[PDB]
Write a protein that binds this ligand. Structure first.
Ligand SMILES: O=C1Nc2ccc(Cl)cc2C1=O
Ligand SMILES: [Ca+2]
Ligand SMILES: [Ca+2]
Ligand SMILES: [Ca+2]
Ligand SMILES: [Ca+2]
Ligand SMILES: [Cl-]
Lengths: 359, 362
């Protein structure tokens, strides 16, 4: 295996394949068909990047330490050409009068996701996928014993792709049109897979091809291909989580609401930050207190219809939703003091959030 | 005690005075004092204190109390830009009001707030903010961090004649910087605790107004604008820095700072993860840097330099070298060598104002 390539053409590939990250700490390099392919994996998912080779090259494959190789390439000057030469247990890297010998492990030892079969496929702009994940990812569970919640549901229905995330306490759901009729289908992508996928997608106008199998998902954009195993469990139905008949409706400025929550939380319990909402005619009062008997109170002029009520919320859950919305006005749909609330952008129905009350 | 102040007149002062801030509750509090048209805020960790004075243009009433620094700061920061922040002491609570935002904070008496003892200045001088910033940035990275030799966990400040000098060492590497001040000073040598050095550094906003320094036998004070920093000194005798400088480092090497920095940075990748050793081979107009690790991996960098001394091989901890090159921030570097078992002295090729001594490694 031998190739020469511009540093500039390796930089983004190396960045992408380095997260998922003993051979799991290595990158797989393969020269074939005038292409350098770089692969990183953690056994559950894999990222592949391809780079065209113009300069003379020789086919072959090896694995090298990812961080060492990345740091070498990044550390070379802008404009550097990088020559690579496999020599048994070492891979030689040369650029100008900078020379490196890295230890190798065999390509044959590198874990390979087993072959699988695609069952549903579609293309959508990477920007749409990014929107769907950003709208919902914060509501995924982290290391719950309900293993099926440590990830995100991807659902196709009609002409929409929908994402759902929940940790049992709050839920986020977002649906986007993709311009083609799809079979009805749902799979759970593991949370680390979601985060890696999210990081693969930049700001560009770029078609993203998605292929979903029984046990795997794959996304292809430009010269990158991401593949993850799926989570094999039964995900809750968001339709049954949405409040069925809220009779109380609050509307307020997103940022005013956000800043009022954030201030009141200062004097909530540091270990478990919650605030009390008192809603009445045209007014919202948010209060907090802590074991030192310190107290905060915020009064806001708001749009409100319904009976007077008091209800508590975990601050981080509400702030997470308001931060995700990034909009002018927010709507809160309430039922009673012991039932979850729905929160949406007043000007958009593409996402919705359900939050259980606290206390 | 009552005052009302515009949010942004409180914020920077609150941020500054919270610098030294845990162990007991009152040490997590700021002292607030209204007297003679001024709100004074003070934070302390018992070794040092930072004081801010904020002018009061709105009606106020005199008095003092202490309140939790983090909570009070976060409240002020979280209020909208231009918010008027009204404060009223009410015994065991201090009330804060802005618009229809209301907060009650638990207080501890001003009379219980720890007070750095009174002391007398022995030397005083004024200097540009930028000169003090230069002196500290040039040397601060060479201070020890929690070394059992307490005298190294700090920075020597030395006045003599028309010069102020800083020195820092951790026993393995040393930094010294000297700047003219245009006033003749008595000979004084003091050790400023590392936390105080960092606070002093962070109080320099890099604007026009000068810094006024006062030094006693056991204290140091710096006044800039409406901030006053005071610290106790490390009661210790700093080792004689002058005799750690190589006595005749005749082999001089010159090369581009960034050229060197990047080559060492790349070589470091394949250096021992714990010991970080690199090898320098100097020969006529050439520097070869090598690294290898226990796994038998190897890096080599060859650089064109100016060098006409004898060939020699010497090893260094690459982090110590990179620290120096990063501090220098200059076009060219001069390295002054003796032999394979003696320290190197490194300087900006353009100036002797800062010098760096790094011991070799086996
Ligand atoms: O299984 C679930 N039931 C729920 C009720 C309310 C919210 Cl916010 C989430 C969930 C679940 O995940
Ligand atoms: Ca080039
Ligand atoms: Ca290897
Ligand atoms: Ca090997
Ligand atoms: Ca594609
Ligand atoms: Cl390419």
């Amino acid at each position: 295996m031998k190739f020469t390539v511009e540093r500039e053409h390796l930089l983004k590939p190396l960045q992408q394949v380095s997260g998922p990250l003993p051979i799991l700490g290595n990158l797989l390099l393969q020269v074939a068909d005038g292409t350098l392919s770089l692969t990183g994996t953690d056994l559950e998912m894999e990222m592949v990047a391809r780079v065209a080779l113009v300069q003379p090259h020789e086919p072959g494959a090896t694995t090298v330490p990812a961080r060492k190789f990345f740091d070498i390439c990044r550390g070379l000057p802008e404009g550097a050409e990088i020559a690579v030469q496999l020599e048994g247990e070492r891979m030689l890297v040369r650029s100008g009068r900078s020379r490196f010998s890295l230890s190798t492990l065999p390509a044959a030892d590198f874990p390979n996701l087993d072959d699988w079969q695609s069952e549903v496929e579609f293309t959508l702009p990477q920007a749409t996928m990014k929107r769907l994940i950003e709208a919902t990812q914060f509501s995924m569970a982290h290391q719950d014993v309900r293993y099926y919640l440590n990830g995100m549901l991807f659902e196709t229905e009609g002409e929409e792709l929908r994402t759902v995330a929940t940790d049992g306490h709050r839920l986020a759901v977002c649906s986007m049109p993709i311009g083609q009729s799809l079979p009805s289908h749902s799979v759970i992508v593991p949370r680390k897979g979601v985060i890696e996928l999210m990081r693969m997608l930049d700001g560009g106008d770029n078609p993203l091809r998605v292929q979903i199998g029984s046990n795997n998902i794959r996304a292809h954009v430009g010269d990158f291909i991401f593949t993850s195993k799926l989570v094999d469990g039964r995900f809750p139905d968001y339709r049954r989580v949405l409040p069925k008949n809220p009779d109380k409706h609050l509307e307020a400025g997103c940022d005013l609401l956000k800043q009022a929550f954030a201030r009141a939380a200062i004097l909530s319990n540091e270990k478990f930050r919650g605030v009390r909402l008192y809603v009445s005619e045209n007014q919202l009062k948010i209060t907090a207190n802590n074991p030192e008997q310190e107290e905060a109170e915020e009064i806001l002029d708001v749009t409100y219809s319904g009976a007077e009520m008091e209800i508590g919320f975990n601050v981080s859950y509400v702030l997470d939703v308001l931060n995700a919305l990034k909009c002018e006005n927010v709507r809160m749909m309430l039922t009673d003091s012991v039932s979850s609330v729905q929160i949406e952008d007043a000007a958009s129905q593409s996402a919705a959030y359900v939050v259980m009350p606290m206390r």
